[PDB]
Amino acid sequence: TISGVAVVAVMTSPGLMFNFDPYLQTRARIEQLEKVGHPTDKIELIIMGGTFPAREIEYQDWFIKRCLDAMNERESKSLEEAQKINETAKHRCVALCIETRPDYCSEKEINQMLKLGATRVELGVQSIYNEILKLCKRGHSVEDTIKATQLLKDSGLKVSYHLMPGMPGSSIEMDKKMFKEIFTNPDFMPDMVKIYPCLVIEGTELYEMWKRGEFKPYREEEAIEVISYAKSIMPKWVRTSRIQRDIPATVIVDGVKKSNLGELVYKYMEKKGLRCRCIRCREVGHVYYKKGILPDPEHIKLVREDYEASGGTEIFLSFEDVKNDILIAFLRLRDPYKPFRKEIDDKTMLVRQLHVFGWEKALTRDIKEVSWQHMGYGRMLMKEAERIAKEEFGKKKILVTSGIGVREYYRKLGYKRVGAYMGKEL
């Protein structure tokens, strides 16, 4: 199904076809999407590799500048100019996700990521168990993941965990406990998770372990059991990725090779009566595609759910059809714990995310065009966030983590640039 936001994923230098040129990769993806009539006025830029924050700042600044240059369709003198231009370009960068190892997520690196316009950070967590991490000779600890998570949350950023069921030393029950722990231990509480079973690819450490008889990866049945359990307990405030991989089956030495793992999981959950209520399962566009129904306006309500995370409080505000359990929009509001950014006081609330599910063309369903933006849901969630911040938590200013290409939207709501954020005095 076609989304209103175009995902443009690019690869950093040690993809192959363009010798890792940031501009060429970004341009080629945009043109490829325009070829098949997908909208490209809103772009989520994804920096792939996981080592980008460890590269020279000169390289990072230039790489993001050139991506924005491709979106702007013109050269710029500097990162900051490319960002300013992009605020009103035809192809706006509404979100920027950087993948990183959890030990490459210091305050200094977070400052740099904010400078670049980052709105989401994906940590290569893999496992929350130090036994498993050291057994596979990973370069980080769970303590790194916990600290990274806190620093990211207290800087207003969205946090994603890449997680790998079925690593060496793990078990079905251990993996299930990991997912339970990630959603009920405040040290974790990620906003989104990307899950795929551990695979055996030639030329990796896991391949060496496999050859020695130290590692037998999950088959489909094990992966489906774990992921089905994980989805059955995922909170309503967690967003999951489409279960998939961009790794061809002719490179998987051992492990799950089939390409419909997500569909297999769905059918397993049907058979077992396991319900899914996380964001992807309930979002208006996916429900329509999967079940053919739309929100019932007689039952749309503003809903709130709070939880403790990284020493502070997360407030998850949503508009939802509460009869049919269909999610229309949401806002992530946080009372921070131990911020370090100069713009975040102990009288500051953080709007870490505002998302109104918009234009969506379901080719396989017959109401083709469906949208929920420009209906007032975003503004009503922002107003409720401001009221909660001021009246309930006694805060005096509210800072919004804004994509470069979304700053204008918050200006319309009375926000102004405050350092790396869009802010408003309450």
Numbering used by the authors: 74 to 87, 123 to 534
Give the published text:
Elp3 acts as the catalytic subunit, but the loss of any of the six subunits results in hypo-modified U34 tRNAs in yeast, indicating that the complete integrity of the complex is important for its function. The enzymatically active Elp3 subunit of Elongator contains two functional domains, utilizes multiple cofactors, and conducts a unique uridine base modification specifically found only at the wobble base position of tRNAs. The two domains form a cleft that contains several highly conserved basic residues, which bind and accommodate the tRNA anticodon stem loop (ASL). The current model of a radical based Elp3-mediated cm5-modification reaction is proposed as follows (i) Elp3 recruits SAM and cleaves it to generate a 5’deoxyadenosine radical (5’-dA) in the rSAM domain, (ii) Elp3 hydrolyzes acetyl-CoA in the KAT domain and (iii) an acetyl radical is formed by the products of the two domains and (iv) is transferred onto the C5 position of U34 in the bound tRNA molecule.
We used full length and truncated versions of purified MinElp3 in crystallization trials and obtained well-diffracting crystals for monomeric MinElp3Δ1–19, MinElp3Δ1–46, and MinElp3Δ1–54. We solved their structures using a poly-alanine model of DmcElp3 via molecular replacement at 1.9 Å, 1.9 Å, and 2.1 Å resolution, respectively. Although all three versions contained various lengths of the N-terminus and also showed no signs of degradation, we could observe interpretable electron density only starting from residue V72 in all collected and refined datasets. Therefore, we believe that the N-terminus adopts a highly flexible conformation in the absence of substrate tRNAs. The main difference relates to the Fe–S cluster loop region (aa 87–123) and the Fe–S cluster itself, which were both completely unstructured in all monomeric MinElp3s. In our MinElp3 structures, we could not locate any bound Zn-ions and instead observed the formation of a disulfide bond between C384 and C389. In addition, we observed that the acetyl-CoA blocking loop (aa 466–486) is positioned outside of the acetyl-CoA binding pocket, interacting with the last visible residues of the N-terminus and also contacting a neighboring symmetry mate. We have previously reported that the ASL of (Dmc)tRNAGluUUC is not sufficient to bind to bacterial DmcElp3. In agreement with this data and the described importance of the extended N-terminus in MinElp3, we observed that the central basic cleft of MinElp3 is not sufficient for efficient ASL binding. The affinity between the truncated MinElp3Δ1–46 protein and the ASL alone are comparable to the one of an unspecific polyU sequence towards full length MinElp3. The first 45 residues seem to have a particularly strong contribution to the binding and deletion of the complete N-terminus resulted in affinities comparable to DmcElp3.
